Design a protein around this nucleic acid. Structure first.
Ligand SMILES: [Zn+2]
Ligand SMILES: [Zn+2]
Lengths: 814, 115, 62
RNA sequence: CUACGCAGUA
RNA sequence: GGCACUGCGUAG
């Protein structure tokens, strides 16, 4: 029958299915089933789970059993395999030692170890001097890695004598340096992973070494207690009075990071205040049973509950719309976007969604090649460090974060901070780590779902330093046209048409494809955020040294990845994800999206049978991909360029931080040479730990229809100046709901109303070209209502209701 | 400049205010217990805080954790000193019962002092 | 269509309830919020009327 | 080009 | 009472 094999020879290379005591299944079957996951064909996974008593037959009759979000209990079922997997690891090491004692030079593949852990194969082995034969275990461990943390194989290391029946290990409560334990863990399990492993990423050679060591530490940090991770404090004496100040940090991925300027100055006052050490040290203990998230302290005597008010209602606009025939029974245009109110327990319930974030150990060789390829998408932009006087801030009347919001807005801090002080703080962050506290506040906005949304306001120090670090690259990305990332490209004045024409650039059999990320801001693995930060920091080869770049990465990890959440008046620890109030949320999201797409393409090309490929060039590309992925250590720039050109030709992407429109060769995807929805679903399952459903993904066959939805806009082909141009229109329900329901009563009457509707009439003009009549009448409704507002309030303003003002907004003149 | 001076004074005052709230009786002991002198932040309240706040969403968790007037947590014996509801109104220990559970405004904030 | 104006009346009812300082009580505010959200997300007109009558009775209690 | 206010998008 | 981008609005 069909069995999964990891094959590499002169003809074919890849991890693919082939037609070809000893158990029925092998470890490669488990890895393939958990990596290339399709709910339509889940048989092999089902007998794997049932045979080894991970669950019962009746379990799969439950709907959405595979989904992580819908059925978190599956995290238990997979965990039942973990110990078995752990045993395999041990046996593997023994096997390696045996080969080293027999002078055997061989390559270890997943498809030669049954699920009992035994190795039943001895082919491709060549004798050498006894005591010297070296195994090759790059592909084995690299492919096995995601299953190590999907099944939680190392949980048995949390008990005394590594025995499940025995109780937990009572680690010293004051212990924070677990380096020796990390060495022991690496020595028992990954003994023959010959690349050097540094538990503390301070001692890493470059970005790739940082990624490799962090990948190991993410797995190794699950054993240790969660109270040890976080800022390391010290009791110092200033002006003759004691203080508690953080003199380091303990990252689950970067190990122990000690500051270099530990000394025991408005800049130093900010460094002290932003530190959570002083706030948590004086705070009372907290036990918040509402969430499974670890709690730190309660900064106030009473817990605070924040409620979301119901949105106001515009009787004037609704009455006008009803008088014109809108909101009629059976109409195609209805109200589906409302202001949803929430009770006092909404904020903590939203914060509880971080339980979807899990410790994910990415495939290290695949991730390294993928970051190499993703770096090609950012070779056109330029970035570097900038001085305090070159930093541009959009608005200074926003919140300055906690605890700085007790004293003033960000304008006050930017005014008090002289340019020399800002530069001194920025140079300080390159040597030391400044942990910060970020507030989460319920957001008040239109939605079509009743789930609450929160925003993570970050402190002023993190904002300032991250701006000085990243603003040059951010403004370079936002000012580039015709690239993969379309951030900063205006949809107006023919921008949508230009973007779509760029996406359709010379694809042989073009089909459009689009997807969405479930719980993107809550379920993103820490490794992918670290890799995105490293990619955004790759522009600093000439301005920052190795130590400066590493300490900047550590600062970003401490102030984004492992934040202190000031939720409802209490301090919690964020397991991971991304902060919606971060400085580089959109760009890191774009890097992560491109990473996921490239990973899907690599998986699709490697999982192809290879022998059935009719193109010599594609087969050679696949063979070189495998030998540069799991067999080549240093970066091969020639093949990276070749594969990047291959993707750019056959897989054209338009990415805005979550929204991806892909123009792909239909024939190549059909043969399996290019990623499809199934590949993205598999990648999200085994990397992002979220099940992607077919309801949130779309595919388009005819390009004249355009993308089904990009940035919540639909695309249609219309006539302008004897030219067929692509024109985007929004949901009429969204526009009508925005008109009917305003944020506060101040926007229910007055001059401001006009401006509001004008903007809406700018966004909902294209509906006039829609074949459906109600959509076309929406814009005329808005125009007539704006005319009525002009009549009520009261020749320059006469342009507001004439259609030419909005006609000009979608012509390529400007 | 005036805003800068006022904010410097305010932040110094707030740091000092947290300082006066900080008790060295257990912090010094745990600091000297460590050989390096650095301790994780997350274990400072777990070993030096005198007051504990527990938020109870449902009666099952209340019975599991702090059913009586005195319970144990973080390897320390805590004694209940106050119980309030989501309206910040005092709720007596006898008021909390399975029969009276629908009448209570959950969640319940119970404040205890170390023993 | 009665669905639309029922939804609008439910929105204004919850707004006036909030203006009546009903959000001080946890249970009453939670019930009102759940009723209003269910009304807005409902697709049955009769169910919308039933929940709106329940919310209006809650308002009429005080 | 600057200040302010609003709208849309993630 | 968060970031980034685009577009309008009144003032030079
Ligand atoms: Zn390293
Ligand atoms: Zn730099």
């Amino acid at each position: 029958v069909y069995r999964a094999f990891d094959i590499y020879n002169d003809k074919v290379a890849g991890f693919a299915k082939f037609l070809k005591r000893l158990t029925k299944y092998t470890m490669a079957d488990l890895v393939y089933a958990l990596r290339h996951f399709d709910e339509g064909n889940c048989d092999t996974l089902k007998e794997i789970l049932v045979t080894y008593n991970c669950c019962d037959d009746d379990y799969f009759n439950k709907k959405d059993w595979y989904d992580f979000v819908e059925n978190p209990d599956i995290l238990r079922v997979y965990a039942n395999l973990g110990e078995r997997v752990r045993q395999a690891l041990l046996k593997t090491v023994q096997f390696c030692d045996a080969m080293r004692n027999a002078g055997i030079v061989g390559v270890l593949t997943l498809d030669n170890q049954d699920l009992n852990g035994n190795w039943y194969d001895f082919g491709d082995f060549i004798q050498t001097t006894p005591g010297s034969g070296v195994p090759v275990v790059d592909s084995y461990y690299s492919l096995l890695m995601p299953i190590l943390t999907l099944t939680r194989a190392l949980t048995a290391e949390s008990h005394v004598d590594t025995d499940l029946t025995k109780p937990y290990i009572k680690w010293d409560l004051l212990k924070y340096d677990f380096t020796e334990e990390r060495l022991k863990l690496f020595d028992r399990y990954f003994k023959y992973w010959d690349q050097t492993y540094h538990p503390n990423c301070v001692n890493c050679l470059d970005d790739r070494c940082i990624l490799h060591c962090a990948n190991f530490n993410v797995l190794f940090s699950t054993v240790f207690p969660p109270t040890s991770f976080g800022p390391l404090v010290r009791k110092i004496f200033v002006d003759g009075v004691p203080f508690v100040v953080s003199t380091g940090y303990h990252f689950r991925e970067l190990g122990v990071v000690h500051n270099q300027d530990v000394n025991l100055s408005f800049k130093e006052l900010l460094v002290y205040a932003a530190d959570p050490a002083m706030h948590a040290a004086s705070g009372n203990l907290l036990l918040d049973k509402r969430t499974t998230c670890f709690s730190v302290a309660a900064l106030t005597n009473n817990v605070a509950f924040q409620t979301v008010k119901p949105g106001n209602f515009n009787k004037d606009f609704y009455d006008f719309a009803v008088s014109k025939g809108f909101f009629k029974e059976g109409s195609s245009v209805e109200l589906k976007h409302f202001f949803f109110a929430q009770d006092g327990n909404a904020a903590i319930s939203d914060y509880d969604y971080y339980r979807y974030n899990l410790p994910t150990m990415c495939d290290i060789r695949q991730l390294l090649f993928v970051v190499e390829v993703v770096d090609k998408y950012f070779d056109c932009y330029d970035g570097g460090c900038i001085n305090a006087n070159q930093v541009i801030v959009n608005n200074l009347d926003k919140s300055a974060g906690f605890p700085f919001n007790k004293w003033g807005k960000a304008r006050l801090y930017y005014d008090s901070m002289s340019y020399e002080d800002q530069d001194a703080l920025f140079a300080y962050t390159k040597r030391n780590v400044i942990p910060t506290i970020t507030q989460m506040n319920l957001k008040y906005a239109i939605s079509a779902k009743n789930r609450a949304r929160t925003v993570a306001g970050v402190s002023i120090c993190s904002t300032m330093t991250n701006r000085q670090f990243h603003q040059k690259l951010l403004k370079s990305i936002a000012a580039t046209r015709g690239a993969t990332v379309v951030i900063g490209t205006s949809k107006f004045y023919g921008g949508w048409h230009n973007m779509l024409k760029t996406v359709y650039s010379d694809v042989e059999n073009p089909h459009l494809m689009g997807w969405d990320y479930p719980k993107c801001d809550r379920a993103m693995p820490n490794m992918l955020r670290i890799m995105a930060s490293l990619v955004l920091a790759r522009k600093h080869t000439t301005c920052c040294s190795l130590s400066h770049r590493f300490y900047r990465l550590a600062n970003e990890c401490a102030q984004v990845l492992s934040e202190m959440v000031m939720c409802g008046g209490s301090l919690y620890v964020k397991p991971g994800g991304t902060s919606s109030g971060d400085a580089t949320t959109a760009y890191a999201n774009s890097v992560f999206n491109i990473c996921q797409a490239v990973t899907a393409n690599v998986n699709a090309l490697l999982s192809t049978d290879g022998n059935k490929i009719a193109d010599k060039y594609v087969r050679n590309l696949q063979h070189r991909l495998y030998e540069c992925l799991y067999r080549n250590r240093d970066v091969d720039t020639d093949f990276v360029n070749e594969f990047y050109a291959y993707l750019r030709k056959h897989f054209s992407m338009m990415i805005l931080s979550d929204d991806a429109v892909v123009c792909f060769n239909s024939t190549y995807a059909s043969q399996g040479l290019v990623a499809s929805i199934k590949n993205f679903k598999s990648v999200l399952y085994y990397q992002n730990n979220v099940f992607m459903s077919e309801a949130k993904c779309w595919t388009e066959t005819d390009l004249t229809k355009g993308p089904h939805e990009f940035c919540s806009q639909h695309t249609m082909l219309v006539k302008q100046g004897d030219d067929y141009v692509y024109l985007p229109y929004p949901d009429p329900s969204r526009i009508l709901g925005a008109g009917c329901f305003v944020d506060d009563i101040v926007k229910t009457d007055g001059t401001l109303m006009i401006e509001r509707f004008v903007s809406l009439a700018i966004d909902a003009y294209p509906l006039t070209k829609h074949p459906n009549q109600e959509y076309a009448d929406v814009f005329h409704l808005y125009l007539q209502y704006i005319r009525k507002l002009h009549d009520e309030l009261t020749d320059n303003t006469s342009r507001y209701w004439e259609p030419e003002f909005y006609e000009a907004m979608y012509t390529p003149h400007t | 400049e005036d805003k800068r001076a006022k904010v410097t004074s305010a932040m110094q005052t707030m740091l000092f205010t947290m300082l006066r709230k900080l008790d060295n009786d257990a912090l010094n002991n745990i600091i000297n217990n460590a050989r390096d002198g650095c301790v994780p932040l997350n274990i400072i309240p777990l070993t030096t805080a005198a007051k504990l706040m527990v938020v109870i969403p449902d009666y099952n968790t209340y019975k599991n954790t702090c059913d009586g007037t005195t319970f144990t947590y973080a390897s320390a014996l805590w004694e209940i000193q106050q119980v309030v509801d989501a309206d910040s109104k005092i709720v007596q220990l006898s008021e909390i019962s399975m029969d009276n559970s629908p009448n209570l405004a959950w969640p319940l904030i119970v404040t205890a002092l170390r023993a | 269509s009665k669905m639309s104006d029922v939804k609008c009346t439910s929105v204004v009812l919850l707004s006036v309830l909030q203006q009546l300082r009903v959000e001080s009580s946890s249970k009453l505010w939670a019930q009102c919020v759940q009723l209003h959200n269910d009304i807005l997300l409902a697709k049955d007109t009769t169910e919308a009327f039933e929940k709106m009558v329940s919310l209006l009775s809650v308002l009429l209690s005080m």
